[PDB]
Design a protein around this ligand. Structure first.
Ligand code: ACD
Ligand code: ACD
Ligand code: ACD
Ligand code: ACD
Ligand code: ACD
Ligand code: ACD
Ligand code: ACD
Ligand code: ACD
Lengths: 155, 151, 155, 151
């Protein structure tokens, strides 16, 4: 316990990664029909994201060293989120034909709202020396979610 | 066809009643299962928002057919909130007071989204009673938030 | 605009200082009788304190340089709060005789609660290199408020 | 002697009514005076908690004497909350949405302290109605919080 125990931050990353990866597996396996289980995966992901905001609210700021140590796990999580979004977009045809396009749209709008809250929280923990890269990562994920929102809009 | 509304009500009822089963028999110790039950309930609530968002408003006949199930669900939610408050002592002793507070804040936000959406779907003849039931739930959640605050 | 604009933090300090100083002047001028105006001064101080929590919630962390620059204004504010508390305690006799001892006690308990919330907020903004001195300043103010609570307890 | 209760009611009524005067005639522009009005109202509310904390419970006859003034005050608070919501557009255009949201969160916390205290003072014969009025105010504050969230 000499150093910081930044395990709170690592746990949030892992919890979100677990939710993303379950969604991703299910979206890749999906080849048509009822998509309720995908919406439910999305809602476990929203819960993980909002759990993060609450878990980390009262944490002290990250040092440069502490934040640097999280750059790897955060870039990995970005990569995973962006891939999951692409795999979702890839399944637009079966999803829309099954009558789930709107519902997916609506889930994505809730993902966007939750991601924005978590990004905002993160910006209150990162030291200035990592503020630009952290914002870049957050913007990438926001742009990915918007791509998904745009793909399912009007369906 | 109003099966979308009946499915939401049933899914939330499943989750509320499972929570009531577990909280009534909880006397102390680890409460992770109770938080999980609350998570399922938030997910059901959000699934409801996503499901009903683009449904057109209910006719007086369609809404009337939902009155029984809705009123029962209201009563079950009010019971869940009171049961939770009743178990504050063991939950706080177990170190779960802050977790319960945080989960209730998420319940409050999800419920508010669903309530606002419901108010757009109900016909005027049932608007005042629907609002009364929604307000009771919202106020009850807040009373739970008050009970666990600072723990 | 090149540097941080830490004016949000300075405004909170000034707003609290304004409320403290009005209370202090009124407590020193008080020599008996109705003390409702003192309770009202205390409640302007509670508002300033809670306004601070809300104003600063979404700020990014302070750098070492930024936090260092606030050490002076924060020590001055501590000095002012501790003095006000002493001047309040000094007036215990007329306050108690006027029937205001409980009410002062209750006001102080609300000051304590609000100061705890603000201290907690401050701990989420200070970088580690100033975390011990910031905690020491916060503890000093808490100990002062407790001295006042103890003086008016049971009255 | 229940003058302490009458003074609290009058002080909160002064503040609520001043706010109603100002919000009803507000059509846009700087809203700093409206926030000041809200600040006075929070101070009055907290002054009430501090004042009544140690007063013993009300007899049925003492509480009955407060029913008129309390019910009027309830109605004025519900009006203030609706009036505020009605002026969301000019308040948000003026750049005051977040300030209003933050002030309402403080109103909510102050009101919850005072409501909890009141519930300890009211005799049983008026407990259910007192709680109903308190819940309506709490839920109304929350509806204002919802209206200004994210602005
Ligand atoms: C089936 C319905 C759709 C399922 C959802 C589809 C894909 C996953 C979507 C979005 C990713 C959501 C949340 C990512 C969470 C946190 C990163 C942002 C926080 C930050 O930047 O700090
Ligand atoms: C590269 C910055 C270094 C660490 C960032 C700090 C904290 C993040 C740790 C936990 C928060 C949980 C998930 C992060 C969500 C999305 C990626 C972060 C995007 C951002 O950066 O907003
Ligand atoms: C560990 C915490 C778990 C506590 C869970 C117990 C109760 C949760 C309380 C309320 C949420 C229940 C249902 C939400 C669904 C409908 C109400 C909103 C719709 C409306 O009103 O129109
Ligand atoms: C008793 C009058 C209300 C009947 C209106 C009929 C149907 C409402 C439609 C859907 C309800 C769906 C989810 C919310 C379920 C229960 C919470 C109380 C509902 C409310 O009331 O918000
Ligand atoms: C001494 C380190 C620098 C601290 C600066 C950070 C935040 C202070 C600025 C604004 C907050 C407003 C008032 C602070 C109140 C009491 C002194 C700070 C106590 C602490 O230290 O908790
Ligand atoms: C009738 C009673 C009048 C009040 C008595 C006098 C003073 C109240 C004392 C303290 C409350 C004032 C300020 C708290 C502000 C900053 C400290 C934040 C805690 C921290 O950052 O560490
Ligand atoms: C009709 C309710 C019976 C009146 C109870 C008698 C006295 C109330 C006690 C204290 C009054 C002081 C402050 C609160 C004032 C108004 C809000 C509604 C309160 C309520 O409704 O409690
Ligand atoms: C700019 C924001 C200003 C908004 C102000 C408008 C309305 C504020 C609403 C409610 C607070 C008013 C009074 C609190 C009094 C009584 C409730 C507690 C006692 C009880 O219930 O028993």
């Amino acid at each position: 316990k000499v150093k910081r125990d930044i395990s709170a931050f690592q746990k949030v990353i892992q919890d979100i990664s677990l939710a993303v990866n379950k969604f991703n597996v299910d979206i890749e396996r999906y080849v048509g029909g009822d998509a309720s289980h995908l919406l439910a995966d999305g809602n476990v992901l929203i819960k993980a994201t909002l759990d993060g905001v609450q878990s980390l609210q009262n944490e002290p700021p990250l040092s440069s060293m502490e934040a640097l140590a999280l750059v790897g796990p955060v870039q990995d999580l970005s990569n995973q989120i962006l891939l999951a979004i692409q795999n979702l977009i890839d399944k637009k045809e079966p999803l829309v034909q099954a009558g789930f396009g709107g519902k997916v749209e609506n889930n994505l709008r809730q993902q966007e709202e939750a991601a924005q809250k978590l990004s905002e929280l993160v910006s209150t923990k990162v030291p200035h020396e990592l503020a630009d890269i952290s914002r870049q990562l957050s913007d990438g994920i926001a742009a990915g979610i918007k791509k998904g929102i745009d793909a399912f809009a009007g369906t």
